[PDB]
Design a protein around this ligand. Sequence first.
Ligand SMILES: COc1ccc2c(Oc3cnc(CC(=O)Nc4cc(C)cc(CN(C)C)c4)c(OC)c3)ccnc2c1
Length: 306
Amino acid sequence: NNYSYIDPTQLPYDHKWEFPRNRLSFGKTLGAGAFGKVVEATAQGLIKSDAAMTVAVKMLKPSAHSTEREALMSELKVLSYLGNHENIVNLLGACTHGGPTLVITEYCCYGDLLNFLRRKRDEFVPYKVAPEDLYKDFLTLEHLLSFSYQVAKGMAFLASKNCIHRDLAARNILLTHGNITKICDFGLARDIKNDSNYVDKGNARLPVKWMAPESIFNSVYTFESDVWSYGIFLWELFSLGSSPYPGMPVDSKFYKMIKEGFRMSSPEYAPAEMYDIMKTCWDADPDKRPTFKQIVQDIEKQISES
Ligand SMILES: COc1ccc2c(Oc3cnc(CC(=O)Nc4cc(C)cc(CN(C)C)c4)c(OC)c3)ccnc2c1
């Protein structure tokens, strides 16, 4: 199955989510893949008062086949199932009748974290920010720790609901107001065929540099494989949006080195204690890797200490 613990087809879909598609006015595309897209839209009547609201709508393109159509439905059943959580992109509604299925979520105004990190890289301040220059919205080490904590909190939640992400990366984390991170999954709304972070492994285009050895060599995805990905996310975060294993292509030598125990060194801005988390996430033995709840407790202490 394309889901390890839960079966989304057996999961129900509450019609409390059902939203009239005529009440959706579409805007610009926030992201698009071969078979799907995420578009910005204005939803009318989503609030008790006549007030309009900005939402993000995931949908398929006419290029999509039955397997993608089924994927979008199962994705909807899972989002319905998870419900409200601060560190997860929240579902607002859906359109199942009247045409193609539309998945309506909240709009995260700052977009994906990867691009945010990249545009903030050159103005990053490791130490404390001056009171005068606070308006400039400088990225600090405090924000990075807050983001690493929130993503673990979100992942801990997902894990308690027996959900495996299978693509935990900075590109699949959105940033909203108040420096709040929200785990998402662009999936079909990402052009993986042209994204250099995805690699041809057999007949698939997989994010190999974020995958645990067991996921690469056995296509087994567990709670422990998501912890590995998180460790790579931590590297991207404290590297301020750098691509993992810089200068190393995904070749025979790459696979051999990961199997043999090669692991990235600490990014330039990673506190020593955060690198310790990354090293444990990358343990060759999945049973020796921390759980997301362990990670939460670890980061929580690091935060209090500062
Ligand atoms: C300003 O720029 C932007 C740019 C993009 C935006 C945005 O993009 C989206 C990303 N993804 C989805 C679907 C999704 O998140 N699925 C999903 C999420 C979780 C927590 C769990 C699972 C289960 N899987 C197996 C792990 C699936 C969207 O649906 C409409 C939109 C959302 C909000 N605001 C956006 C603002």
